[model samples]
Target: AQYEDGKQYTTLEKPVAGAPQVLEFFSFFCPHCYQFEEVLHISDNVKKKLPEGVKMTKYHVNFMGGDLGKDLTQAWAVAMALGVEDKVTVPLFEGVQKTQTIRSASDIRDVFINAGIKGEEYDAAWNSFVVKSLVAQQEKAAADVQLRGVPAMFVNGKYQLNPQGMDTSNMDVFVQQYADTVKYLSEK
Candidate 1:
């Protein structure tokens, strides 16, 4: 999945160096992701023990630029560039779900700003080519992954949450179990 890092020619895809990539295939408007957020820590703890060279990257799946969900995702690319995801992604999620809307780009920005991101940095990042390109790539990856729904995790090249491969009911446990799986794959 190293090809996933920045191969799509998008800022959202370009990862800030220093960690082994751990990509969690997700969506901004995804209800399952919101639900999974409730329990992702089960796996977070296991992931903490991963060998050196492991990092977590959240991939926001957009079917296309025209999709309604893109409004929420625009912030994702910027957060990656600004390196403030740990500071604001979850708060952005809470705002969107709490407000029950995604009708405007400015509204999404407001949510991000309220979460502690600087207005100037957010503006520049939102308009950067890298940001736009990454969002585009994210959409392409969504199609490639052919996901059934949100809250999917792709460990290295192998993916989880394909219904039969890893049932949603087992997601909580799978989150932890999958890290070892990803570590194994990264080594290969």
Candidate 2:
């Protein structure tokens, strides 16, 4: 079934500027987010269907309160700043979900090296003030949203897409449902 705004989704108090932004609040360690990637063929199936004018952002959640959370969040922010998110994101997730190999910041760095990222590039981006600031921004955003779980989505920074619930058991169905909701809100 399609989502109804007041029920499945929710309107935010203030809307963000520019084209609608579809933000995914996710965690590298979250099994659900991992499933969304592995089972959904995420890039081709889910992201490819986003509305032409809508922008997508992956916000890593930092509520886990330890090195695991901080390390993954920082790693993602660094990858994003270095413009290597497309190359590193999936592998990072798999490293945790499949191989159980990424347990700290060191492991994250190794993943980058393994992915052909130069040592200098990794060091510069990973320790940059910009990367640190971006991680802070993500932390603030996560707190502001009072996010309850990974795989949570928001549209336009105003509408909480499927905030209360969603049926994620079927990746195909969930992707279509999420895409439909975002499309409807983008036109409003």
Candidate 3:
């Protein structure tokens, strides 16, 4: 749905490079984010349909602000740092939201281990300055957006999707609306 004031998505004063960036600010501990994963499972389909110049990235939000939150957030950031996001992202999310297996750094390391990451390799990435830096960056980004909750969606770094009035309880409808919104913005 379009905003009547022609501000469907909030516009950034200084747009990030590549005018349009579709970003999802999420937290591993969020139940709704777990549900959102169902929609994300079809990301292959979404990516295939994405118009040129539109890119999507998921950033972990450390809203909980504790060891558990920091650990999981760092785990995800490290996974991205190690260039194994595709291999470990969903599994980490699943391990937490479904199996309830990940609770500490050791548990998260095990998840990566099962995904074929070596002990030393995982350690290196998990303990890397790059991972820490990225996690800090994500935390700041969340604050910059004035984020209030998980599974928040942003289109072109400006539009903060407000689906409060929409039937977001239906996963398929929510996914379609997200895609439609991005597509419409990309066109413009």
Leading candidate by TM-score: 2
Model 1: per-residue lDDT, tens digit, 35-145? 556556533654676677667667676643355567656668887777777776566666656565445788778766787777897898888999998777666665654
lDDT of 2: 0.75
Query: What's the true lDDT of residue 110 in model 3?
Result: 89
Cα lDDT, model 3, residue 116 = 95
lDDT of 3 by residue, 47-151 (tens): 666797677777887776468888888888888788887888778778788898887878888888999989999898877899889898777777677777877
- Model 2: per-residue lDDT, tens digit, 9-109? 88766655542277777888888788766676543453666767656777788766367888888888988898887788878888888998987788889
Ranking by lDDT: 2, 3, 1
Ranked candidates (TM-score, high to low): 2, 3, 1
Compute each candidate's TM-score over C-alphas. 0.69, 0.86, 0.82
Off by over 4 Å in 2: 1-3, 13-20, 42-46, 163-170
Clashes per candidate (backbone, < 3 Å): 6, 1, 2
Error of 3 at 155 (Å): 1.5
Q: In candidate 3, how many Å is residue 12 off?
A: 7.3
lDDT of 1 at 152: 60
Error of 1 at 43 (Å): 6.1
